[PDB]
Protein backbone atom coordinates (compact mmCIF):
# COMPACT_ATOMS: atom_id res chain seq x y z
CA UNK A 1 0.00 0.00 0.00
CA UNK A 2 1.14 3.75 -0.93
CA UNK A 3 0.56 5.16 1.93
CA UNK A 4 2.25 2.65 4.52
CA UNK A 5 5.92 4.41 3.95
CA UNK A 6 4.45 7.64 5.09
CA UNK A 7 4.62 6.27 8.50
CA UNK A 8 7.65 6.78 10.28
CA UNK A 9 8.88 2.97 11.93
CA UNK A 10 5.35 2.01 10.93
CA UNK A 11 4.36 4.50 13.53
CA UNK A 12 3.27 8.30 12.83
CA UNK A 13 2.58 9.74 9.47
CA UNK A 14 2.11 13.52 9.34
CA UNK A 15 -0.75 15.25 7.15
CA UNK A 16 0.04 19.00 6.95
CA UNK A 17 -1.36 21.20 3.87
CA UNK A 18 0.44 22.63 1.06
CA UNK A 19 -0.41 26.30 -0.46
CA UNK A 20 1.42 25.23 -3.71
CA UNK A 21 3.45 22.85 -5.64
CA UNK A 22 6.98 23.94 -4.20
CA UNK A 23 5.23 23.98 -0.99
CA UNK A 24 4.31 20.70 -1.06
CA UNK A 25 8.04 19.60 -2.43
CA UNK A 26 9.50 21.54 0.54
CA UNK A 27 7.08 19.84 2.97
CA UNK A 28 7.69 16.38 1.83
CA UNK A 29 11.68 17.11 1.67
CA UNK A 30 11.29 18.46 5.43
CA UNK A 31 9.43 15.24 6.75
CA UNK A 32 11.65 12.87 4.85
CA UNK A 33 8.74 11.54 3.36
CA UNK A 34 6.86 10.73 6.31
CA UNK A 35 3.63 12.62 5.41
CA UNK A 36 1.24 13.11 3.37
CA UNK A 37 0.58 16.38 1.93
CA UNK A 38 -3.43 17.98 2.25
CA UNK A 39 -4.89 19.42 -0.91
CA UNK A 40 -8.44 21.06 -0.93
CA UNK A 41 -11.41 20.38 -2.96
CA UNK A 42 -12.91 23.41 -1.85
CA UNK A 43 -9.88 25.58 -3.57
CA UNK A 44 -11.26 24.56 -6.85
CA UNK A 45 -14.49 25.15 -8.66
CA UNK A 46 -14.63 22.01 -10.51
CA UNK A 47 -13.93 18.65 -10.28
CA UNK A 48 -11.57 18.71 -13.31
CA UNK A 49 -10.04 21.50 -11.81
CA UNK A 50 -9.21 19.81 -9.10
CA UNK A 51 -8.12 16.48 -10.41
CA UNK A 52 -5.49 17.98 -12.56
CA UNK A 53 -4.27 20.12 -9.68
CA UNK A 54 -3.93 16.83 -7.42
CA UNK A 55 -2.16 15.14 -10.51
CA UNK A 56 0.55 17.71 -10.45
CA UNK A 57 1.02 18.20 -6.84
CA UNK A 58 1.60 14.15 -7.09
CA UNK A 59 3.81 13.92 -9.67
CA UNK A 60 6.85 16.14 -7.74
CA UNK A 61 6.15 13.85 -3.95
CA UNK A 62 5.28 10.07 -5.24
CA UNK A 63 1.46 10.90 -5.27
CA UNK A 64 1.85 11.27 -1.66
CA UNK A 65 -1.55 13.65 -1.56
CA UNK A 66 -4.10 13.53 0.98
CA UNK A 67 -7.31 14.77 -0.53
CA UNK A 68 -9.10 17.02 1.43
CA UNK A 69 -12.26 18.53 2.19
CA UNK A 70 -11.47 21.76 3.42
CA UNK A 71 -11.73 21.86 7.27
CA UNK A 72 -14.37 18.82 7.06
CA UNK A 73 -17.00 21.04 5.72
CA UNK A 74 -19.41 18.32 4.71
CA UNK A 75 -20.68 20.13 1.80
CA UNK A 76 -17.43 18.84 -0.19
CA UNK A 77 -18.01 15.01 0.34
CA UNK A 78 -20.03 14.44 -2.62
CA UNK A 79 -16.67 16.56 -4.73
CA UNK A 80 -14.56 14.66 -3.09
CA UNK A 81 -16.30 11.09 -4.07
CA UNK A 82 -16.41 11.95 -7.35
CA UNK A 83 -12.42 13.20 -7.58
CA UNK A 84 -11.90 9.52 -6.21
CA UNK A 85 -13.17 8.71 -9.80
CA UNK A 86 -10.16 10.39 -11.29
CA UNK A 87 -7.48 10.54 -8.69
CA UNK A 88 -6.67 8.38 -5.93
CA UNK A 89 -3.96 10.36 -3.92
CA UNK A 90 -2.70 8.12 -0.80
CA UNK A 91 -4.90 9.27 1.30
CA UNK A 92 -8.40 10.56 1.47
CA UNK A 93 -10.33 13.08 3.86
CA UNK A 94 -14.42 11.87 3.70
CA UNK A 95 -17.30 12.36 5.99
CA UNK A 96 -18.80 8.93 8.00
CA UNK A 97 -21.74 8.26 5.37
CA UNK A 98 -19.72 9.22 1.83
CA UNK A 99 -16.87 6.86 2.80
CA UNK A 100 -18.86 3.93 0.97
CA UNK A 101 -19.18 5.61 -1.88
CA UNK A 102 -15.92 7.02 -2.23
CA UNK A 103 -13.91 3.63 -1.75
CA UNK A 104 -16.49 1.95 -4.78
CA UNK A 105 -15.62 5.31 -6.69
CA UNK A 106 -11.52 4.06 -6.42
CA UNK A 107 -12.45 1.00 -8.42
CA UNK A 108 -10.45 -1.23 -7.08
CA UNK A 109 -7.29 1.76 -6.95
CA UNK A 110 -5.47 1.40 -3.43
CA UNK A 111 -6.01 4.06 -1.36
CA UNK A 112 -6.34 5.18 2.48
CA UNK A 113 -10.22 6.74 3.73
CA UNK A 114 -10.82 8.50 6.70
CA UNK A 115 -14.40 8.68 8.20
CA UNK A 116 -14.79 11.82 10.53
CA UNK A 117 -16.60 11.55 13.13
CA UNK A 118 -17.10 14.02 16.03
CA UNK A 119 -16.84 14.32 19.76
CA UNK A 120 -20.34 14.37 21.31
CA UNK A 121 -19.16 15.56 25.59
CA UNK A 122 -19.90 11.70 26.89
CA UNK A 123 -16.80 9.35 26.82
CA UNK A 124 -16.76 6.23 24.93
CA UNK A 125 -19.31 7.67 21.79
CA UNK A 126 -18.94 9.13 18.50
CA UNK A 127 -21.21 11.44 16.71
CA UNK A 128 -21.45 9.79 13.22
CA UNK A 129 -24.03 12.35 11.59
CA UNK A 130 -21.16 13.87 9.69
CA UNK A 131 -22.42 14.15 6.27
CA UNK A 132 -24.66 17.42 5.41
CA UNK A 133 -28.59 15.71 5.68
CA UNK A 134 -27.46 13.95 9.12
CA UNK A 135 -25.40 16.56 10.68
CA UNK A 136 -28.63 19.57 9.75
CA UNK A 137 -30.77 17.42 11.54
CA UNK A 138 -32.41 17.96 15.40
CA UNK A 139 -30.53 14.51 16.88
CA UNK A 140 -27.27 13.04 15.91
CA UNK A 141 -26.53 9.41 16.08
CA UNK A 142 -24.28 9.42 18.80
CA UNK A 143 -23.01 5.52 18.93
CA UNK A 144 -19.74 3.56 20.55
CA UNK A 145 -16.91 4.32 19.33
CA UNK A 146 -16.00 0.28 18.16
CA UNK A 147 -19.64 0.28 16.52
CA UNK A 148 -18.82 3.02 14.34
CA UNK A 149 -15.13 1.31 13.68
CA UNK A 150 -17.27 -1.91 12.47
CA UNK A 151 -19.07 0.13 10.36
CA UNK A 152 -16.73 1.96 8.54
CA UNK A 153 -14.84 -1.08 8.25
CA UNK A 154 -17.78 -2.23 6.19
CA UNK A 155 -18.11 0.71 4.22
CA UNK A 156 -14.31 0.52 3.32
CA UNK A 157 -12.49 2.75 5.68
CA UNK A 158 -8.95 2.71 7.18
CA UNK A 159 -9.56 4.43 10.07
CA UNK A 160 -11.22 7.42 12.57
CA UNK A 161 -10.80 10.83 11.26
CA UNK A 162 -11.46 12.45 15.49
CA UNK A 163 -12.70 15.89 14.42
CA UNK A 164 -12.76 18.54 16.15
CA UNK A 165 -11.15 17.95 18.65
CA UNK A 166 -9.82 21.72 19.89
CA UNK A 167 -6.64 20.49 20.86
CA UNK A 168 -6.78 18.91 24.41
CA UNK A 169 -9.97 20.07 25.26
CA UNK A 170 -11.90 16.52 25.26
CA UNK A 171 -8.57 15.01 26.40
CA UNK A 172 -10.57 12.15 28.23
CA UNK A 173 -13.07 11.63 25.27
CA UNK A 174 -9.92 11.15 22.83
CA UNK A 175 -8.03 8.71 25.05
CA UNK A 176 -11.60 6.51 24.83
CA UNK A 177 -11.11 6.75 21.31
CA UNK A 178 -7.43 5.95 21.20
CA UNK A 179 -8.21 2.87 23.32
CA UNK A 180 -11.39 1.45 21.68
CA UNK A 181 -9.05 1.89 18.42
CA UNK A 182 -6.09 0.00 19.78
CA UNK A 183 -8.39 -2.84 20.26
CA UNK A 184 -9.94 -2.75 17.41
CA UNK A 185 -6.64 -2.90 15.53
CA UNK A 186 -7.72 0.37 13.76
CA UNK A 187 -6.22 3.57 12.72
CA UNK A 188 -6.79 7.27 14.12
CA UNK A 189 -6.32 11.03 13.23
CA UNK A 190 -6.83 13.27 15.41
CA UNK A 191 -7.64 16.96 14.23
CA UNK A 192 -8.89 20.25 14.74
CA UNK A 193 -6.78 22.46 17.49
CA UNK A 194 -3.15 20.64 17.06
CA UNK A 195 0.06 22.83 17.22
CA UNK A 196 3.44 22.50 18.28
CA UNK A 197 2.66 22.80 22.26
CA UNK A 198 0.30 19.68 22.15
CA UNK A 199 1.42 18.28 19.33
CA UNK A 200 3.60 15.85 21.11
CA UNK A 201 0.83 14.80 24.03
CA UNK A 202 -1.66 14.26 21.67
CA UNK A 203 0.29 11.83 19.50
CA UNK A 204 1.73 10.28 22.48
CA UNK A 205 -1.41 9.78 23.97
CA UNK A 206 -2.31 7.39 20.79
CA UNK A 207 1.15 5.71 21.07
CA UNK A 208 0.47 4.87 24.68
CA UNK A 209 -3.24 3.79 23.82
CA UNK A 210 -1.01 1.28 21.39
CA UNK A 211 -2.95 2.68 18.43
CA UNK A 212 -0.69 1.41 15.88
CA UNK A 213 -0.99 3.93 12.68
CA UNK A 214 -1.44 7.32 14.25
CA UNK A 215 -1.67 10.33 11.65
CA UNK A 216 -2.10 14.01 13.44
CA UNK A 217 -3.48 16.84 11.20
CA UNK A 218 -2.04 19.97 11.65
CA UNK A 219 -2.66 22.82 9.39
CA UNK A 220 -3.56 26.89 10.15
CA UNK A 221 -1.08 26.30 13.59
CA UNK A 222 1.92 26.12 11.05
CA UNK A 223 0.62 27.98 8.19
CA UNK A 224 2.71 31.43 7.50
CA UNK A 225 -0.11 33.72 6.88
CA UNK A 226 2.53 36.46 4.69
CA UNK A 227 2.76 33.81 2.40
CA UNK A 228 0.28 31.11 3.02
CA UNK A 229 3.14 28.42 2.90
CA UNK A 230 2.88 25.84 5.87
CA UNK A 231 6.48 26.29 7.34
CA UNK A 232 9.22 24.18 6.41
CA UNK A 233 11.35 24.56 9.99
CA UNK A 234 7.92 23.78 11.20
CA UNK A 235 7.55 20.50 9.77
CA UNK A 236 10.83 19.92 10.57
CA UNK A 237 10.60 20.48 14.33
CA UNK A 238 7.52 18.20 14.14
CA UNK A 239 9.47 15.17 12.21
CA UNK A 240 11.97 15.56 15.02
CA UNK A 241 8.91 15.15 17.74
CA UNK A 242 8.06 12.21 16.19
CA UNK A 243 10.91 10.59 15.74
CA UNK A 244 11.72 10.97 19.23
CA UNK A 245 8.49 9.79 20.44
CA UNK A 246 8.18 6.73 18.34
CA UNK A 247 11.72 5.82 18.80
CA UNK A 248 10.46 5.03 22.73
CA UNK A 249 8.24 2.16 21.37
CA UNK A 250 10.83 0.27 19.43
CL1 LIG B 1 -10.57 17.62 5.27
CL1 LIG C 1 -10.69 22.36 16.58
Redesign the pocket.
Known amino acids: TNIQKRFYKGRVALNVLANNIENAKDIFEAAEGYVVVGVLSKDYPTVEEAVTAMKAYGKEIEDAVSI?????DNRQAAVVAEIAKHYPGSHI?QVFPSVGATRANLGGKDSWINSLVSPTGKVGYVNISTGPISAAGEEKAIVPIKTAIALVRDMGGNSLKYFPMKGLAHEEEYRAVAKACAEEGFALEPTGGIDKENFETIVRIALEANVERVIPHVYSSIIDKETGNTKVEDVRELLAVVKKLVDQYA
Not at 68 to 72: D, H, V
Open positions: GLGAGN
